[PDB]
Design a protein around this ligand. Structure first.
Ligand code: NA
Ligand code: NA
Ligand code: NA
Ligand code: NA
Ligand code: NA
Ligand code: NA
Ligand code: NA
Ligand code: NA
Ligand code: NA
Ligand code: NA
Ligand code: NA
Ligand code: NA
Ligand code: NA
Ligand code: NA
Ligand code: NA
Ligand code: NA
Ligand code: NA
Lengths: 154, 154, 154, 154, 154, 154, 154
């Protein structure tokens, strides 16, 4: 079934964003492990896997709609310290959140209700899992201090 | 069996207090989870369930005595920081403790020995479980500092 | 993430409604048990638990959106006989249904698609589980008579 | 193997009748569930499945005989109350019974002894299971009254 | 709860379409088995069951909304060869897809958000399961030839 | 119990036919194995066993009726290539089908209803299992070509 | 431990190559699934996972050596038909093979014997698993023809 060209193009925009999110969590998780914060490694490794699944869902939807997936990831922007890495991931998730919400509205406009539902599922993950957890970590650093927070992530 | 009107009225006073205690622990537990203190979430979630059971016991006793339960909870007074929330819960439990003790004396006066026993069981829970745990948390904050205490509740 | 103030306010309106629904099912279920209708006790006890979960989902969403939950339940309006209690619960569920549908439209307007999805899930429960079951009970009373219906609920 | 054209045509007549019987039990069973008579839902849901199997056996026999199955169901005639629905199903089963008996005689005449045996199996189901159960329900309504009967089917 | 008449009418249009889809897959699956293509029999038999479930969901929703289900299936249009049968099923699924998308928009317009969600679930099945699989089979025939494809379906 | 001489004689005619069918499937199945078509070996080996059981049922019925079984098999007519062997078996099964149908009519005429039932069971096997499968194989060869069909039977 | 800058730079070159290989197998595997070649999907999905592990090993080695990983994948070059996709993957693996062999020699020169061993393990995978399998598939197409080969990959 040929999808609407505007929807396919927009799904491709989201795909390159999620390929990038995957890769930013790839490098951050391994940096956290390099420093000995295995709890941070585990969480972000899980997030890398979740973004790979999100990318996969978009890629397969684009194919179903007879489009050609764009596989070049967006640029990533890793941090150099734990607070910078948390903030960088939160900025990325906030961007993905806004992009997904714009996509949902576009899908509704072009009456692509299945694509809308795929994006809604990803939007729920972004808001309620990914971004929320990051906000929590930054809030913990604010409440107990960075040194105590880092200790908790060994 | 028709209970004594003064006893039924007093049980209703306790019921609206325990419905409120339930709801204060509902909001506090979820606030603790929002901030990432899952140990505090778990404890206060348990306390919400225990207050629901306490309320249930009163409600069912009032019905047995042919009274009409009052289901409007008392006002609650949540805190805005972990120390404020602990103190607010401790103030509430201290109020419930005093109210329950007054109720036990009233039940004895009107020779409602089963109602007295229900209240005694709740009084033991209030003193030895709920209020004691809160006093302990505040004491821990005093002994190790707030930042270390918060770290321990992740 | 700061949610839209109109959405947060509306979620709070729904929250106080579901806290009330919880408490109306609390008193009705225990009244049904007081009279010996254990099948009615079991169903409405289950419904109390489901409304607590619905309230919980709203409360947690409001927190995520950086709002402050309103924990005062709406007034409840219990019945005094089995037919009155069924009708009172059905009136409440019909009100909740309309409120949820209005909320879904508001969330769509403000592009809060995750809040919309939470409300849609609750709307499906309200229509297809809660209200439908109540309509069925009233229909059974109409078809077999109240005395036979009550017998069936022992 | 090419079957006798008169036999194939007659099997097709039976097929469209059993496709209809399937669909009448589909709507009646779901109507019974809509009203809260889950015992009636379960029985007629089972009967829908049995008529689908009966239709399947005819369809496959028609194909084996190199015929072309007729897939348009006969018109159905659902009732609007429990007694009307029972009577409507009994009228349908009585029609199917007569049609099957006529088919058995035709198959014997054209020496299609396997088709005869398929129809005999369906005839036994119609008489001893489907129609008999319906006759029993109507007899129960006659003996205990409709209200008691409906109570028994919750 | 009385549903909107335009929504109920439209659900009935979808119901008669899915009853037809059920029956087209009924005849095609058994034709595939008649020829010895058991893999095609199994898939389309599964699809018949899925369309029966889709029809069931619509029928039950129409009843809940106090409507009267229309049980006459639309006409079906079976093929006479494997490529014709695949194409006929794909044409049917493309029609169902468009009808479901129009229904979702109508439900949104009349603020029947639960009916919309039921249709969205069916739309996802139609696009991502039913039609996609058919497109794949036709593509396989194009890539390996019909004779090799048929061999693979024994 | 002495059976009717015409029935016993006719059962003996069927017996020598089924002893022959057994032996034709014996040689064909082993020829298929000799060439490396193990799927054809397995099917026809199964068919040899089924014809032995059919012969056994006739033999035992003839004895019960105080007749003397005729144990000389009819001549067999094996093919020399896979298509010839399939056709030869189909010709044999078509002959057995006609003979069994004539026998059923004779048994009915002489009121030997148990012998009729034994023959009906064998007739169903012949039509719905043996001959049908052969027709399917020849149809597969027609649809995918002989070389692909042979490949599928390795 | 600070690694040799020439070795770290070269590991980064290999990393961006393996991130690209991962993504080329991501798109090819999902294209194969889109067309219904599930055996090809499974193999290339496995290869995507293996390249992710290869990339991970390089990334972690670069971190250990106090380098900064380069996370931008090389450009990929997907095919548009099964033979083109196989050839494109084989060209990529041949490039990776040569790059890894050059890296091993460089590591030996700079006496980084652990980095050499990591690359040797990847070189064995590339030659004996990835490239070999691709060569085999192309050889199969040459020996049995493309249509038969595609049939085998359903
Ligand atoms: Na994502
Ligand atoms: Na994310
Ligand atoms: Na510490
Ligand atoms: Na208490
Ligand atoms: Na307490
Ligand atoms: Na609710
Ligand atoms: Na409800
Ligand atoms: Na009764
Ligand atoms: Na039937
Ligand atoms: Na029947
Ligand atoms: Na459907
Ligand atoms: Na479908
Ligand atoms: Na036989
Ligand atoms: Na035979
Ligand atoms: Na082949
Ligand atoms: Na590699
Ligand atoms: Na490789």
């Amino acid at each position: 079934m040929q999808g609407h060209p505007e929807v396919i193009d927009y799904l491709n925009t989201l795909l390159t964003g999620e390929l990038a999110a995957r890769d930013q969590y790839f490098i951050h998780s391994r940096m956290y492990e390099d420093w000995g914060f295995s709890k941070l490694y585990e969480r972000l490794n899980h997030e890398m896997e979740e973004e790979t699944q999100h990318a996969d869902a978009l890629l397969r939807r684009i194919l179903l709609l007879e489009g050609t997936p764009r596989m070049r990831p967006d640029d990533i922007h890793p941090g150099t310290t734990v607070p910078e890495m948390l903030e960088a991931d939160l900025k990325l998730e906030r961007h993905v959140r806004a992009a997904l919400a714009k996509g949902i509205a576009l899908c509704e406009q072009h009456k692509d209700f299945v694509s809308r539902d795929i994006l809604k599922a990803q939007l729920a993950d972004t808001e309620e899992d990914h971004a929320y957890w990051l906000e929590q970590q930054l809030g913990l650093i604010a409440r107990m201090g960075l040194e105590n927070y880092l200790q908790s992530q060994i």
